[PDB]
Amino acid sequence: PMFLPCVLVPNTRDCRPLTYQAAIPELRTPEELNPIIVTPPIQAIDQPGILYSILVGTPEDYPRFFHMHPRTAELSLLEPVNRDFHQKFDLVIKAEQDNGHPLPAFAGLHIEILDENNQSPYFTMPSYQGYILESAPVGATISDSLNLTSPLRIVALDKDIEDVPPSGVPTKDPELHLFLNDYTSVFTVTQTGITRYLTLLQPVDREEQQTYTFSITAFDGVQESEPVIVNIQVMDANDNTPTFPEISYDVYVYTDMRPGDSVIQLTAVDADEGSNGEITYEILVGAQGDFIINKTTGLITIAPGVEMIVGRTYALTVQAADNAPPAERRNSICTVYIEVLPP
Template sequence: MLNKGLPAACLTLFLCLLVIVHNVKADVSYSVLEEMKRGYVIGNIGKDLGLNVNELFARKARIDAEGNRKRFCNINVGTGDLTVAEMMDRENLCREKLSCVLKFELVLENPLELHKITLHIQDINDNLPVFPKDIIKLEIRESADKGARFRMIEAHDADIGQNAVQNYMLERNDYFILAVSPNNDGGKNLELVLDKELDRERQQELTLILTASDGGIPPRSGSVQIHVTVLDANDNAPVFTEEVYRATLPENSPIGTLVIKVSATDLDEGINGEVTYEFSRASSLAKTAFTLDSNTGDITVSGPIDFEEESIYEMRVEGKDGFGLSTGTKVIIELTDVNDNTPEIFLKSLNSHIPENAPPGTEIGIINVQDRDSESNGEVHCVIGSNMPFKLVPSIKNIIPL
């Protein structure tokens, strides 16, 4: 310990003497693989410096770390070996530096002597390539052109050189290939390239596996899942469930009666798949008699329907999606007759003056009987009162001689 009472001149002389005896000798350099176990012999520093074991012991040889938190090396004074004192992880010590160097000093006493030791930590392939995400999510519209490119994120490997990431491989699939090219900072540009056009109606989602591998022996690898959601494009027209819709309806059905429902489906999503309906061809009479709901496809009675006026209605209905793709179908509505008409009698001719001696069978008049209904509803049976000297004789259709 320095004496505080010494003159300034004496203090200066003491410091000078201390510097003079701090003698730095030749440097030595070694290399060692990272993660070697404690006690592993790096080299024999005694032989390399020309020091025998007796001298090492007598001069209290020791290793001092130079700015390192841990003393990763020891010297065995009995053998002169420089050994691993603490397992060294290159990635923890030097991060991503290409060169990982630790510096120490071999300290000898009596006389005081220092030797600088440089220790190069060599990388081993002890890390896997790792992608920043477990899943990469992409949304790609099905209308994307063949050759479209989608940038991918690189994998990272904490190792360096050949032990870092060297190759990428995309799992075989029907739609994408992988394009890899070098970039300016020494890494690689990764792009998914669309090799076959997507079809959302055929496959809405895809799962791809991208694998990165390093150049170690044996190589190590890491993978990431790419989840592709195929977005819809309006590439499908509506399709009706029937080419021709047929319905039978009694005449005089009340307004609001559901006649038939047309339905078309569109494989697209959202507004591209929303179908609306309208008459594309219908007579004015049909448009008066029937209404088509544009959203549901329901055709209902909206006006009077009379079998005797029109017995069959043929209409064309168009189904259209949100962006104008459309298709058509035919609707045929047949009315069935209801007995809603009374027979009508028309006197076509009549001989009002008949001689009393007219022979039986003499025709005296013609009566026309009509019923607007059809089939059995339109069949008419005519009778004449009893105790009359006349009878009805059917003639041509609906005309009865009297």
């Protein structure tokens, strides 16, 4: 006899060496899995009764685990299979005539022992602390430090795919899904690879929200990881000009006023953080000598050694500028208009 299916070797009359396939969960019992299923069904045919056996195989303890019924060719498991010790089996199945003159046939039978997807994935870190500049575009990549040079790396593994030791370099991609439980509208995460990354879906304003706290969760097709907390800091850029409440001030002074006295108290606002939002005031021109401004306070006073003459008018050009780097610094101007009355 000869095994089904027969597939001619091109340009001859031999069947192709045929190899049956089966696969089995580890640590599960004869009762549970029997009968073991074989693609394609093991069958042989004459062209009077047929006998199915196992000649040989590797490892040599194949007979500990596998018995083959000799008329049907049905395959049984005799013992649970611990994948730690046993991973595959390559057998040579035989089929012959129950005559004294057999015309026997051979096929292979590969048996794959499987790690079943009964463990939930984990992240190699207890939490994540990422950074991005409010100035970054859609598509840009969360970073691991204030330097914004390295991207934030998120590694999630599954022990049903490879048992990596707690220090260990991984080598197999567990083909997992990672999902954010919040801010799904703002951030996304690379959907493939051992290492995953974050990127913006939508730009972010430090002056709105400067921190994002959410968790990510892994999924292997069946179970999920514990959630792991990710935490994203939005770093300041100088996107806010020191603006004044008004564009013009009308201010009257009197002749009996003396040096040091208050004229007007200006106060600009710069929503930025740090020194990007720190304000410095100067009078660019118009003082004519008779007024000065507190660089820090925005309070204008009457200059030292100076007399208010009842005629005079002035137009002070006053500037507020933040203390960013000169290349990135901003400013905004208002005019204070003054006239001297008598007491």
